[PDB]
Write a protein that binds this ligand. Structure first.
Ligand SMILES: [Zn+2]
Ligand SMILES: [Zn+2]
Lengths: 218, 217
């Protein structure tokens, strides 16, 4: 199985440089081109450049001249992209993809690497439980939730009961305000199962090396 | 730079029916060597893009044969014989004929399904947030269709637009509905001076807006 494993999310200050990786496996690394594309929040795709590890040839998007450079480490089957003189315009998700062959497009893609360029400090999330208040919420089904507030930077991972509870879950896109993100997540379960079968949301924020579990109590 | 023009949206499509997405290039993508440098990619919410069609009409490996592509070399069409719920997402055309390689703006495909009223749930501030001087009132409006909706917040009967943060989910890949979260963020000080808090939703499934509320006491 062809696999492209990209490095983890990055929070870096403007004016500096960051280098992200794409470890490939499952095929002859030196026989195919690897390309990189940029996707800003709410935007489409922008091609950055391609690299052929077998001789180390590169084709680049001149729009990024002096901003990006592609390299490859054949001994580790890893491709790299370094971005310099960073500004908020560089904040985005970068994907690496393999070119299936002779002009057959990107047939395999990495999971993407989120890069945030900001002067703001990393701040762990505050997780607040959302349990049925003053108004008997339904009766056949009941909706619970968690409010994740005041964290930076993106992203956070939300699961319920450590991932064992997935149906009826809605985790909403985070919204930025005053340099802090806020997100929410709801889960609808059978009324006859709660509170007998506990419900707990788990919020992981790698950036701050923090994870908090909040059990929802009546 | 080669410009690829695609509509931002497609008309809602009935599940099980055929659908088409088009893309127009500012110049022929046909090579002198006879190769058409046109590709179609699909990106589902929170996922990496997937290749569907390469060289204008060749089916990518890993892509279901429900998808097909054609074109004149300058105008292109991606077709879906039978649309499924999991097909929702954004379809992009792209070209690598000339540098810099470019992508179209993407066309979002939406599934048409039966109207569904939103299930509204309102939640007062948690004791834990209040302790820190904050007071967020949360309102979930889940599984509704169509997507068009308006939420209004009222404190003691008066509309409040300040301090409201809304977020939406993409069309669900299973039931084809939409969901929305609206949060009214106040300071504890402010929260404690008023009594009734209301979340109101205006949707085509009801003449009167769907209301949910509670009284601080
Ligand atoms: Zn739902
Ligand atoms: Zn007031």
């Amino acid at each position: 199985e062809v696999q492209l494993e990209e490095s983890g999310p990055e929070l870096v200050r403007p004016g500096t440089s960051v280098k992200i990786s794409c470890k490939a496996s499952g095929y002859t690394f030196t026989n195919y081109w690897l390309g990189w594309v940029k996707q800003r929040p709410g935007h489409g795709f922008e091609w950055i450049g391609d690299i052929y590890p077998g001789g180390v040839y590169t084709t680049n998007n001149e729009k990024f001249r002096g901003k990006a450079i592609l390299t490859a480490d054949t001994s580790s089957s890893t491709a790299y992209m370094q971005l310099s003189s960073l500004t908020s315009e560089d904040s985005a998700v970068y994907f690496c993809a393999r070119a299936g062959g002779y002009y057959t497009g990107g047939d395999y893609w990495g999971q993407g690497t989120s890069v945030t360029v900001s002067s703001a400090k990393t701040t762990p999330p505050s997780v607040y439980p959302l349990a049925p208040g003053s108004a008997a919420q339904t009766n056949s089904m009941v909706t619970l939730g968690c409010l994740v507030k005041g964290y930076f930077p993106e992203p956070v991972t939300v699961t319920w009961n450590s991932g064992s509870l997935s149906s009826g879950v809605h985790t909403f896109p985070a919204v930025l305000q005053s340099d802090l993100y806020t997100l929410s997540s709801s889960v609808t379960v059978p009324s006859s199962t709660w509170p007998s079968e506990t419900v707990t949301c788990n919020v992981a924020h790698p950036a701050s090396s923090t994870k908090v579990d909040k059990k929802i109590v009546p | 730079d080669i410009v690829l023009t695609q509509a931002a949206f497609s008309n809602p499509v009935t599940l099980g029916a055929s659908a088409s997405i088009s893309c127009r290039s500012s110049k022929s993508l046909l090579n002198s060597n006879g190769i058409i440098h046109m590709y179609w990619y699909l990106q589902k919410p929170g996922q990496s893009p997937q290749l569907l069609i390469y060289q204008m009409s060749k089916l990518a490996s890993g892509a279901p044969d429900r998808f097909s592509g054609s074109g004149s070399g300058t105008d292109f069409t991606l077709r879906i014989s039978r649309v499924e719920a999991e097909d929702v997402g954004v379809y992009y055309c792209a070209q690598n004929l000339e540098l810099p390689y470019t992508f179209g703006g993407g066309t979002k495909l939406e599934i048409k399904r039966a109207d569904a009223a939103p299930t509204v749930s309102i939640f007062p501030p948690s004791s834990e947030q209040l302790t820190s001087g904050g007071a967020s009132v949360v309102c979930f409006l889940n599984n509704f269709y169509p997507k068009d909706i308006n939420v209004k917040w009222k404190i003691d009967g008066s509309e409040r637009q300040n301090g409201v943060l809304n977020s939406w989910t993409d069309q669900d890949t299973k039931d084809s509905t939409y969901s929305m979260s609206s949060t009214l963020t106040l300071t504890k000080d402010e929260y404690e001076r008023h009594n009734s808090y209301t979340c109101e939703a205006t949707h085509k499934t009801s003449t009167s807006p769907i209301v949910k509320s509670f009284n601080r006491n």
